[PDB]
């Protein structure tokens, strides 16, 4: 029962929760227990593509991330080819060593990799770079299957990236996008308050077709999460 | 100040040092203070300040002594009347972290007897006086001398076993502290010390104690309607 909830359609597995979102897409949820404060949920994705599994974001810790891999073994039983992690904070990159130990190739924005050690994180093995329009440079993201990686500009952090899943209704905003009933934008300590609104809108325009918006700290929402996030961010300028 | 958890600043609000103050009624203000958690950001906590004639009454400290001293400095600047007493609403840091600042200022402090018994087990300082309660939750009046408009009610165990609540007589405001979450809340906050069996009934008991309060003030979000009480209770129904 995190401080920052479980419903029908959720599967507990060890200390994590999994929810199927589409025939080949699942949301993973893990929890950080903070002394005196309680547990904080964070969400990522698991995608089955062409006999392999692709992961978006680690859990908060190496042990929780190893639990993700065990769930994948039990439920899907296909090799995990790669992971994409969406910025250099613990909720997204806390489990990199578990991925590396398992032989999984890891990818992050070059800037995330540069920030990683300064943020307490292990860097990904490979760096993604981006065009001026935000789209990933194709040669840096080989064999990504249906994953469409987009850098929307600075927002929650300067390095935040986002991921659409081609052939589905799903796009993943990570910690950039907050839900349509949110009171705030979460932790703004590392945020770019000038550019945030434009970055939220750029995410929406990059994935114009996605009706299910997945994000780190709330359940999947409509495109109203994008609109609402942008309007909250307009107030920061 | 843009806390990670808690309401944001809006029109009305006064920034004073590290805190924010919002007038809720001619004689009632909300104080807000912030705890920075490394890697997570700031967490807001709210209490109340009430003017009762020629004296001021406080509900809850800030997270720290220094923040609580700042509350007292705001009261001196904006109201310029003495603080007669403070009521603190359970033995967690957000509500009792600043007891030493109140004691240094010479302010009489009151808490549930249970909160005073628990405070030292959390490394905190007990209030100097103990409130006790009837079987229906109303404070025993002899334990709450000269409380003016503060009507203290123990609704039963919920967020904690000791949590108390305060209606402000002569207004349409009631304070639920950390028992009550806002009408759009996704969770009941920290349940580490909570009574999941009794929470829903306790939330409803608070609503029934102050049935004509239309403005519900709470620790970690902006003042809300009575939908905060009903939503809290509905979330708590799921815990049993
Ligand atoms: C380096 O990252 N360390 C983190 C961490 O991952 N914090 C993130 C952050 O602050 O952005 C989490 N993300 C958040 C967000 O708005 O995306 C909020 C929730 C706070 S917790 C941390 C340390 C302690 C608790 O969380
Ligand atoms: C002794 O209390 N120590 C606290 C503390 O006051 N925590 C409180 C609590 O957890 O109940 C706050 N209150 C909360 C609540 O649901 O009322 C949530 C917000 C977590 S922060 C603490 C340590 C670090 C952050 O909060
Ligand atoms: Zn982050
Ligand atoms: Zn986050
Ligand atoms: Zn508490
Ligand atoms: Zn609290």
């Amino acid at each position: 029962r995190p401080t920052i909830q479980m419903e029908t359609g959720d599967q507990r597995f060890g200390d994590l929760v999994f929810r199927q979102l589409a025939p080949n897409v699942w949301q993973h949820t893990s929890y950080l227990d903070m002394p005196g404060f309680g547990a904080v949920a964070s969400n990522g994705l698991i995608v089955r593509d062409g006999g392999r599994v692709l992961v978006v974001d680690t859990a908060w810790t190496d042990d929780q991330t190893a639990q993700i891999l065990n769930w994948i073994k039990q439920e899907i039983n296909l090799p995990v080819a790669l992971a994409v992690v969406t910025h250099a904070h613990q909720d997204k990159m806390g489990g990199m060593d578990a991925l590396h130990a398992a032989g999984i190739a890891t990818y992050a924005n070059a800037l995330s990799n540069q920030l990683a050690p300064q943020e307490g994180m292990v860097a990904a093995q490979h760096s993604l770079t981006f065009a001026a329009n935000g789209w990933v440079e194709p040669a840096t993201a080989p064999n990504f299957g249906p994953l469409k990686v987009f850098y929307p500009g600075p927002g929650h952090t300067s390095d935040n990236i986002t991921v659409g899943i081609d052939g589905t209704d799903i796009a993943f905003g990570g910690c950039l996008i907050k839900d349509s009933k949110a009171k705030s934008l979460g932790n703004l300590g590392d945020a770019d308050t000038e550019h945030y609104a434009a970055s939220a809108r750029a995410f929406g325009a990059a994935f114009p077709k996605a009706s299910m918006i997945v994000m780190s700290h709330s359940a999947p929402d409509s495109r109203a999460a994008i609109t609402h996030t942008a309007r909250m961010a307009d107030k920061l300028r």
Side-chain angles (χ1 to χ4, degrees), chain A residues 3-4 34-38:
Chain A
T3 300
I4 304 300
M34 295 180 68
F37 181 91

Side-chain angles (χ1 to χ4, degrees), chain A residues 46-217:
Chain A
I46 299 169
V47 179
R48 174 176 55 209
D49 167 62
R52 62 219 182 110
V53 175
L54 317 173
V55 176
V56 179
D57 293 335
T58 74
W60 298 93
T61 68
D62 289 320
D63 181 71
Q64 293 166 0
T65 301
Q67 293 179 53
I68 293 172
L69 298 180
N70 201 28
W71 179 91
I72 291 167
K73 180 49 187 186
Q74 306 315 319
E75 297 297 330
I76 296 167
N77 197 14
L78 291 175
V80 180
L82 61 91
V84 173
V85 301
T86 63
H87 67 276
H89 280 165
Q90 193 185 340
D91 50 354
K92 315 285 79 191
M93 291 185 72
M96 297 305 287
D97 283 329
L99 296 182
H100 295 160
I104 299 167
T106 61
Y107 296 82
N109 189 355
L111 179 58
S112 303
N113 289 333
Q114 191 166 1
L115 291 172
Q118 300 175 68
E119 291 297 316
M121 298 300 118
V122 174
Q125 295 166 331
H126 303 286
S127 291
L128 301 178
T129 62
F130 298 89
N133 70 7
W135 288 105
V136 70
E137 292 288 351
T140 71
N143 291 148
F144 267 44
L147 304 183
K148 299 299 177 203
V149 186
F150 180 72
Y151 173 66
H156 168 73
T157 57
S158 59
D159 63 317
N160 56 203
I161 62 169
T162 66
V163 185
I165 303 165
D166 191 50
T168 78
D169 299 330
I170 298 166
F172 184 68
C175 312
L176 178 73
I177 304 298
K178 267 61 188 195
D179 73 89
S180 62
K181 306 299 184 183
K183 298 303 216 322
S184 79
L185 291 164
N187 190 1
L188 292 174
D190 299 357
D192 182 334
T193 59
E194 172 58 20
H195 301 118
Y196 202 134
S199 299
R201 294 192 172 94
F203 168 73
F207 304 108
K209 205 188 83 61
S211 58
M212 182 177 274
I213 307 305
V214 180
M215 66 204 82
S216 298
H217 304 295

Side-chain angles (χ1 to χ4, degrees), chain A residues 1-4 6 12 15 17 31-33 37-41:
Chain A
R1 299 187 182 284
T3 300
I4 304 300
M6 213 202 76
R12 293 183 260 187
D15 306 308
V17 169
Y31 305 92
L32 180 68
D33 196 8
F37 181 91
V40 184

